[PDB]
Design an enzyme around this catalytic site. Structure first.
Site, short mmCIF file in Angstrom:
data_model
loop_
_atom_site.label_atom_id
_atom_site.label_comp_id
_atom_site.label_asym_id
_atom_site.label_seq_id
_atom_site.Cartn_x
_atom_site.Cartn_y
_atom_site.Cartn_z
N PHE A 209 -70.92 44.07 32.46
CA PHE A 209 -71.28 44.18 33.91
C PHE A 209 -70.81 45.55 34.34
O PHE A 209 -69.70 45.96 34.05
CB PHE A 209 -70.63 43.08 34.76
CG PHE A 209 -71.16 43.01 36.16
CD1 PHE A 209 -72.41 42.42 36.44
CD2 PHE A 209 -70.35 43.46 37.21
CE1 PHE A 209 -72.94 42.25 37.78
CE2 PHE A 209 -70.82 43.25 38.54
CZ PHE A 209 -72.13 42.70 38.79
N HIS A 212 -68.74 48.69 39.93
CA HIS A 212 -69.08 48.17 41.29
C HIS A 212 -67.83 48.13 42.06
O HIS A 212 -66.73 48.18 41.49
CB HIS A 212 -69.70 46.75 41.24
CG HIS A 212 -68.80 45.73 40.62
ND1 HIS A 212 -68.46 45.72 39.26
CD2 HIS A 212 -68.05 44.76 41.22
CE1 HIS A 212 -67.57 44.75 39.05
NE2 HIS A 212 -67.32 44.15 40.22
N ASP A 214 -66.23 45.34 44.91
CA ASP A 214 -66.51 43.95 45.26
C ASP A 214 -67.06 43.77 46.70
O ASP A 214 -66.65 44.49 47.62
CB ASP A 214 -65.26 43.08 45.17
CG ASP A 214 -64.85 42.82 43.74
OD1 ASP A 214 -65.62 43.24 42.83
OD2 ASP A 214 -63.80 42.19 43.53
N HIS A 268 -64.61 49.01 39.46
CA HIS A 268 -64.20 48.41 38.19
C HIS A 268 -65.42 47.89 37.48
O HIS A 268 -66.50 47.83 38.07
CB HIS A 268 -63.15 47.28 38.44
CG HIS A 268 -63.59 46.24 39.40
ND1 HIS A 268 -63.65 46.44 40.77
CD2 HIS A 268 -64.01 44.97 39.19
CE1 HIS A 268 -64.10 45.34 41.36
NE2 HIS A 268 -64.37 44.42 40.42
#
Ligand SMILES: CSCC[C@@H](NC(=O)[C@H](CS)NC(=O)CCC[C@H](N)C(=O)O)C(=O)O
Ligand SMILES: [Fe+3]
Length: 329
Positions: A209, A212, A214, A268
């Site tokens: 993933f 980004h 959060d 992260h």
């Protein structure tokens, strides 16, 4: 070649009690972590995370393809138009490894005024058959309230950290209306592992993933003891050590907005690891109409040049944006 991120373990137990000096000493630790890498582990949090992991395993390992279609969100099943958030997010063998189950506030029942109004981001949870998953719904609802309690204690610590009274964020985090969600993510072991489910970062790191920030006020995460997260810092991406006894905490972009980026939402990402593991985030979201006026703890008058943003507007925009950026999970 990657160095370890500074992620301190903070004993949050005083945030559950009435010793105000002790709480200030916890608040200072949360401040130091929020201003450094943006992550800490909450320890002495009181939640039985081994039983959470065992009940989650029993669910993920026993649910069948038929049940997953029957619980699927709209992205996977056009018949389920009302399920944007809550339900099953299917794997695509050969293409997409991860799969998960998301649920919202158990208090969003058919008679809840926001459900009646069909207000965006509120949905009634969907649940598997009780006889196929005995005890699961009850366990999962009780877990929502156990991690809600932890999150409320953490939000008292963040408030004190920022120079506010301890109910500054918590008064907008209420059982009757919180938009908070649990996601029970299964990251499977696969042999062979589909290359399409492996992304590659610009630095060559294999990911599951991408980078980004959060969509949350804060994120309260349990994971297995398999190292996989990285945080971007001034010294580049660094590895976050796993700790399956603690909760990994970070701020999301609503906290960055409210504090004028004094507490950044750290960037992260999730490395690809071919391991059977769990990622069980609780996104601490406020109510649909919650608005906190933005401020800036670094300015003598505390004023910020940011516009107030309602949490409902934030959340609905942020969830779409994260799908468009990093893909439908
Ligand atoms: C360390 S990133 C958090 C853990 C997990 N990632 C995620 O959960 C990603 C990025 S935060 N989050 C999301 O995809 C947002 C889910 C929102 C949820 N459907 C809701 O409706 O509230 C993972 O991939 O392990
Ligand atoms: Fe995240």
């Amino acid at each position: 070649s990657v160095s370890k991120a500074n992620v301190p373990k903070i004993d949050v137990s005083p945030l559950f009690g009435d010793d105000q000096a002790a709480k200030m000493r916890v608040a200072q630790q949360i401040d130091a972590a929020s201003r450094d890498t943006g992550f800490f582990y909450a320890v002495n949090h009181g939640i039985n995370v081994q039983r959470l992991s065992q009940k989650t395993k029993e669910f993920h390992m026993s649910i069948t393809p038929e049940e997953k279609w029957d619980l699927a969100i709209r992205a996977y099943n056009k018949e389920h138009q009302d399920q944007v958030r809550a339900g099953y997010y299917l794997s695509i063998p050969g293409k997409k490894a991860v799969e998960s189950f998301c649920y919202l506030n158990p208090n969003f029942t058919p008679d809840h005024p926001r459900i009646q109004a069909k207000t965006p981001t509120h949905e009634v949870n969907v649940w598997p058959d009780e006889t196929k998953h005995p005890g699961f719904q009850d366990f999962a609802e009780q877990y929502y309230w156990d991690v809600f309690g932890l999150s409320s204690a953490l939000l008292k610590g963040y408030a004190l950290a920022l120079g506010k009274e301890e109910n500054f964020f918590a008064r907008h985090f209420k059982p009757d209306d919180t938009l908070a969600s649990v996601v029970l993510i299964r990251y499977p072991y696969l042999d062979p592992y589909p290359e399409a489910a492996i992304k590659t970062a610009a630095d060559g790191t294999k990911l599951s993933f991408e980078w980004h920030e959060d969509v949350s006020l804060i994120t309260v995460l349990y994971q297995s003891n398999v190292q996989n997260l990285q945080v971007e810092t001034a010294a580049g991406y660094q590895d976050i050590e796993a700790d399956d006894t603690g909760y990994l905490i970070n701020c999301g972009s609503y906290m960055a907005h409210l504090t004028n980026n004094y507490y950044k939402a750290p960037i992260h990402r999730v490395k690809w690891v071919n391991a059977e593991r769990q990622s069980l985030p609780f996104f601490v979201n406020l109510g649909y109409d919650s608005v906190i006026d933005p401020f800036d703890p670094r300015e003598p008058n505390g004023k910020s040049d940011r516009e107030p943003l309602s949490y409902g507007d934030y959340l609905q925009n942020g969830l779409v944006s994260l799908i468009n950026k990093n893909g439908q999970t």
